[PDB]
């Protein structure tokens, strides 16, 4: 059943080329350079955050087909992230499509472009995260005018995505926020209704395996003491959020499994002063390496979804698409545009990694 069993995860060359060409030439310490070279080999998801990234998806799948026909057993990992009026609760979104300017039709073409690619590589297992911080905003942010207006477009576009990418080689996980967002007990029943209705309204697609949590966030999987910024939520880590949310989805006909982003949660507690501070958080490290051996029946894999070292947002308040969350004092600064390489942040995640990359473990 688990789409992560039976395969290796591909480490893409977009992140490897970031580390080799941008990061390593800036690092002088020989041990840290070797540690950087190693992290570039940890497989993390490739984000399709514009239409112009879809040729990179096809190139990555072509490389995986080459590797597989040469014996490999790799699967690809991609994030579908280009809804019109994307990031609806921001002061600022980088999304290229607007609902008012043909954005629903542009999203249809974007999904059709990805479906043609996944069908062209029907031999390749393709693991998808669908639309981070979309549906969670329709649970808690209907008070924000852009999100209230985006409700119909988001539900239609999500329904298109999950029905059109319901293919035999795909497993999809709908993004479902994190413990600090939907794990609060008052948010659980409305979120479970919305997610199980998305699944049932798409005719319970076989390929929609479940939900992704902690994407681009920093929560622990399991911690023995709740970090102080989680109080008073009883679901203060992802294990507690998922053990609370899974039976409420199953009660309404969506027997969801989960993947959890551990790419930036190795250091706990984190540097967050408030749990809603999400941008470029100080005091974080790379986490548990991707694996299907999670020790938990509900969790198909620990994965690295947000690629560590790529910025969450610029800290320049005069720049386009600036959001005030990226200038808070627990956000590392100065930070470049969202998605762009942020070398200080990479070095922070490398220094604080747990498990560490600086450990040299090596036998003959």
Boundaries of domain holding 268: 1-364
**What's the DSSP call for residue 21?**
I
> This structure's resolution (angstroms)?
1.5
Q: Which residues pair with 260 in a beta bridge?
A: 213, 302
Q: Which residues are catalytic?
A: 133
Structure tokens at 276: 């809603």
Task: List the alpha helices (DSSP H) in 168-327.
Answer: 185-201, 238-251
Name the token pair of 28: 């002088």
Give the pair of three-digit tokens for residue 254. Answer: 């969506």
For residue 104, CA distances in Å to 40, 101, 122, 153 come to 36, 9, 26, 7
- Alpha helices (H) along the chain: 13-18, 30-39, 54-69, 103-120, 135-140, 145-164, 185-201, 238-251, 343-351
Yes or no: say if 331 and 282 are a contact pair by the CB < 8 Å rule.
yes
Interhelix angle 103-120/145-164, rounded to 10 degrees, is 30
The C-alpha atoms of residue 351 and residue 283 are separated, in whole angstroms, by: 10
Least Cα distance to 330 among 286, 270, 261 occurs for 270
Q: Could you tell me if 123 and 67 are in contact, meaning their C-beta atoms sit under 8 angstroms apart? A: no
Rg, Å, the chain Cα set: 19
**And the tokens for 125?**
């297992």
Cβ-contact 322, 92 below 8 angstroms: yes
Instruction: Count structural domains, the chain.
Output: 1
Could you tell me which residues are annotated as the binding site?
Answer: 278, 306, 310
Distance (Å) of CA 262 to CA 42, 111, 161, 287, 308: 12, 27, 25, 5, 10
CA–CA gap between residue 157 and residue 131 (Å, rounded): 10
Task: Assign residue 203 the CATH number of its domain.
Answer: 3.20.20.40
Binding-site residue set for substrate:
278, 306, 310
Experimental method of this PDB entry: X-ray
Distance between CA atoms of residues 350 and 46, nearest Å: 20
């Amino acid at each position: 059943g688990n789409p992560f069993e039976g395969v290796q995860l591909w480490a893409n060359n977009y992140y490897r080329s970031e580390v080799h060409t941008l990061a390593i030439p800036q690092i002088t310490d020989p041990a840290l350079r070797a540690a950087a070279s190693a992290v570039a080999e940890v497989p993390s998801f490739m984000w399709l955050d514009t239409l112009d990234k879809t040729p990179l998806m096809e190139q990555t799948l072509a490389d995986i087909r080459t590797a597989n026909k040469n014996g490999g057993n790799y699967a690809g990992q991609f994030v579908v992230y280009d809804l019109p009026d994307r990031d609806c609760a921001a002061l600022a979104s980088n999304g290229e499509y607007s609902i008012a300017d043909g954005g629903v039709a542009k999203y249809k073409n974007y999904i059709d472009t990805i479906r043609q690619i996944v069908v062209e590589y029907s031999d390749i297992r393709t693991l998808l995260v669908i639309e981070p911080d979309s549906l969670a905003n329709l649970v808690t942010n209907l008070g924000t005018p852009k999100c209230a207006n985006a409700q119909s477009a988001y539900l239609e576009c999500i329904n298109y995505a999950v029905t059109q990418l319901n293919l035999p080689n795909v497993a999809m996980y709908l993004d479902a926020g994190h413990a600090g967002w939907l794990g609060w007990p008052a948010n659980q029943d409305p979120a479970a209704q919305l997610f199980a209705n998305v699944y049932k309204n798409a005719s319970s697609p076989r390929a929609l395996r479940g939900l992704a949590t902690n994407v681009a966030n920093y929560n622990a999987w399991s911690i023995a003491s709740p970090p102080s910024y989680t109080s008073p939520n009883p679901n203060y880590d992802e294990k507690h959020y998922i053990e609370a949310f899974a039976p409420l989805l199953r009660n309404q006909g969506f027997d969801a499994k989960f993947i959890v982003d551990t790419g930036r949660n190795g250091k706990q507690p984190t540097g967050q002063l408030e749990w809603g501070h999400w941008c470029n958080v100080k005091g974080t490290g790379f986490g548990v390496r991707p694996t299907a051996n999670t020790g938990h029946e509900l969790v198909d894999a620990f994965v690295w979804v947000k690629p560590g070292g790529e910025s969450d947002g610029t800290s320049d308040s005069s720049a386009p698409r600036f959001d005030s969350h990226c200038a808070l004092p627990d956000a590392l600064q100065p930070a470049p545009q969202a998605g762009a390489w942020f070398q200080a942040y990479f070095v922070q995640l490398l220094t604080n990694a747990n498990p560490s990359f600086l450990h040299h473990h090596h036998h003959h």
